[PDB]
UniProtKB/Swiss-Prot annotation:
The record marks 405 as: Catalytically important residue that stabilizes the alkoxide intermediate. Moves to point toward the isopeptide bond. GO terms for cellular component: cytoplasm. The keyword Hydrolase applies. The active site is at residues 494, 577, 605. The lineage of its organism: Bacteria, Pseudomonadati, Pseudomonadota, Alphaproteobacteria, Caulobacterales. The gene is atxE2. PANTHER family: DIPEPTIDYL-PEPTIDASE 5 (PTHR42776:SF13), SERINE PEPTIDASE S9 FAMILY MEMBER (PTHR42776). Gene3D superfamilies: alpha/beta hydrolase (3.40.50.1820), TolB, C-terminal domain (2.120.10.30). GO terms for biological process: proteolysis. This is Lasso peptide isopeptidase AtxE2. One of its GO terms (molecular function) is serine-type endopeptidase activity.
Length: 653
């Protein structure tokens, strides 16, 4: 008994904050008096094809049930300026919603989207009440309480004027130039600089005014998680070579007026977040440690010395932690534990559940998880997780699917929540959840990440190191008699997608592949990016001025390598990215290789519509079952699909 984890289960697991939340992601808020925590829960429904967002308030003593103080809103895309463009096309990730408590602890203020416009809403924390509150010609980008009746908010109306100006310029046609990014649309994009504007709303009158410079500086300033004060000691973090972006940082203590003192313990290196507590005479800090930085660890350090002692450590992630007296309230995530709310006892180590918006996942028949560790041929430590089917007996050689994850925590879908780790194991695959190790270049001295990127791309050195690491991991599971090395699938999104294309060209390790985007070639990196991004990628080592048949692009281009590429490839692409795939896809078809391209409408680099996500999950499982198990699902609504694939398999004669 006990039900299995299926794609239908997976896509419905609720989540908190942006998909790729890490230690400083502000996904939760403590009330001023620390008795309540506020956080948004997101739950995807593949049947309605909508996400259900709720604003939640739970009491930190865990005595009362949580309360939905708001329900509803559309998926709000997280957006940043990025290439000198003011607002790029959405990556597809949801904005983390940070609820803002009123000074009284009475209301929350938070951004919410309806009818494609982002507003400020206010909510009774219990006495329940919906109601939008601030609305403008532009989306509200941020909001704070100045007092219990006054709100300050930010946004960019000059962005909306610039769009209106682009519309006017079109009457005579636009010059194709720096403003264009063809892959994502046929209109000029707004260029930076676009100013941010701060206004304040009186909730008693309904009046807006400008914000005073003092009020601006209170909204525009953000707390530093790598600085803390305890009495007269200022704690901070620094390097002995401050311009080397890869030099490790050390905790530093500035005692009153005196010179900064550096901490000597190895535990003091590479802190990611610190908290000062003046009641206890203590600094607390968070960091990553262990083999290949695979674990989280929390340290407690009596503030009058520099001798931190570890009080908690685990695999997984802790996110958005805030201190209430002797407690840290955190979001926490782990291989078999989706993101939940938790309490950490700041004197003992003890972690305790606070809020889990999903059932206990242990009520399902869960795959078995094991962490793999090795050192690769460059001498660099590597970790990854091996996921095995629930009823697995050592002695059965399994087909293997490789899912790439650029973050940590719950075994969900890898980097874009795109490849269903636990459902695949339920279907009988071994699954490698692969965490690419540090590059060689990252141990050397660089003053700029752009120059580091360039050295990583030189002769695809880091790509080779990534591929060799994958091969080391496969070999390890082959020695254990766990996998069949002739039945290894590879999947990937974002950086994982480039590793897929490189891996299919430069080895024979893979018998099938899935990717969410195509084509590491000059067409995609140069033509479809438009001349601005194309010109700028050059400094990162992307040779956008070189031809596809040159030494750089020959390592990855499917146009150039079409006739040697015998790994079956499925491309499940957002419509916003499919243009880049057409030449490579056409070359593979022309060459009679087994390719298939799927196009999802109104999608982004990361996919956001639950029905799309569920169909990706299912097609990818069907794909690998077919190529790596020679199995098909007899379901009638799949009959056209398996005729398509049987014909692709017949091309191999």
């Amino acid at each position: 008994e006990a039900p299995p984890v299926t794609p239908e289960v997976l896509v419905r697991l609720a989540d908190i904050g942006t998909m790729s939340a890490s230690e400083t992601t502000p996904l939760l808020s403590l009330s001023p008096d620390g008795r309540y925590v506020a956080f948004q829960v997101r739950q995807a429904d593949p049947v309605t094809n909508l996400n259900v967002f709720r604003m939640v308030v739970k009491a930190t003593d865990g005595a009362t049930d949580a309360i939905d103080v708001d329900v509803g809103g559309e998926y709000l895309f997280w957006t940043i300026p990025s290439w000198g463009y003011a607002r790029n096309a959405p990556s597809g990730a949801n904005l983390t919603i940070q609820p803002r408590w009123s000074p009284s602890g009475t209301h929350l203020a938070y951004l919410r989207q309806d009818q494609g416009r982002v507003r400020v809403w206010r909510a009774s924390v219990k006495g329940e009440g919906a109601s939008p509150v601030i609305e403008d010609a532009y989306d509200i980008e941020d909001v704070q309480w100045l007092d219990d009746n006054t709100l300050i908010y930010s946004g960019r109306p000059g962005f909306v004027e610039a769009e209106a100006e682009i519309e006017r310029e079109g009457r005579r046609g636009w010059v194709y130039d720096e403003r264009f990014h063809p892959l994502t649309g046929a209109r000029p994009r707004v260029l930076e600089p676009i100013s941010i504007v701060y206004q304040v709303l009186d909730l008693k009158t309904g009046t807006r005014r400008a914000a005073t410079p003092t009020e601006v500086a209170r909204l525009r300033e953000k707390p530093d998680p790598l600085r803390a004060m305890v009495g007269r000691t200022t704690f901070s973090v620094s390097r002995t070579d401050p311009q080397n972006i890869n030099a490790p940082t050390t905790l530093v203590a500035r005692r009153g007026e005196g010179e900064p003192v550096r901490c000597d313990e190895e535990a003091c290196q590479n802190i990611t977040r610190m908290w000062g507590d003046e009641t206890a005479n203590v600094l607390y800090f968070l960091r990553r440690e262990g083999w290949a930085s695979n674990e989280m660890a929390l340290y407690r350090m009596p503030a009058d010395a520099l001798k931190p002692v570890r009080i908690w450590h685990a695999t997984g992630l802790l996110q958005g932690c805030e201190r209430q007296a002797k407690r840290l309230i955190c979001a926490q995530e782990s291989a078999l534990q989706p993101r939940r709310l938790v309490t950490l006892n700041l004197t003992s180590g003890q972690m305790s559940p606070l809020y889990d918006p999903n059932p206990d996942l242990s009520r399902y028949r869960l795959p078995k998880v094991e962490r793999l560790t090795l050192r690769n041929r460059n001498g660099i430590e590597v970790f990854s997780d091996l996921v095995l089917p629930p009823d697995y007996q050592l002695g059965t050689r399994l087909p293997l699917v490789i899912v790439q994850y650029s973050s940590r925590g719950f075994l969900r879908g890898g980097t874009g929540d795109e490849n269903p780790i636990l459902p695949l194991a339920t279907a009988g695959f071994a699954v490698l959840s692969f965490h690419s190790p540090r590059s060689e270049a990252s141990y050397q001295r660089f003053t700029s990440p752009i120059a580091q990127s360039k050295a990583e791309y030189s002769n695809w050195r880091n790509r080779w190191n990534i591929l060799h690491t994958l091969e080391d991991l496969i070999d390890d599971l082959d020695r254990r008699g766990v996998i069949d090395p002739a039945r290894v699938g590879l999947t990937g999104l974002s950086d994982g997608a480039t590793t897929v294309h490189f891996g299919l060209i430069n080895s024979h390790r893979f018998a099938a592949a899935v990717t969410s985007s195509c084509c590491t070639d000059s067409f995609t990196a140069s033509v479809m990016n438009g001349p601005r991004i194309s010109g700028a990628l050059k400094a990162y080592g992307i040779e956008t001025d070189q031809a596809d048949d040159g030494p750089f692009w020959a390592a990855t281009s499917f146009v150039v390598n079409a006739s040697r590429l015998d790994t079956p490839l499925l491309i499940q692409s957002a419509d916003e990215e499919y243009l880049g795939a057409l030449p490579g896809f056409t070359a593979l078809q022309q060459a009679r290789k087994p390719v298939e391209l799927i196009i999802y409408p109104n999608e982004h680099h990361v996919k956001w519509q639950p029905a799309h996500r569920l169909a990706v999950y299912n097609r990818t499982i069907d794909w690998f079952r077919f190529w790596l198990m020679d199995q098909s699902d007899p379901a009638p609504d799949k009959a056209a699909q398996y005729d398509r694939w049987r014909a692709l398999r017949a091309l191999r004669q």
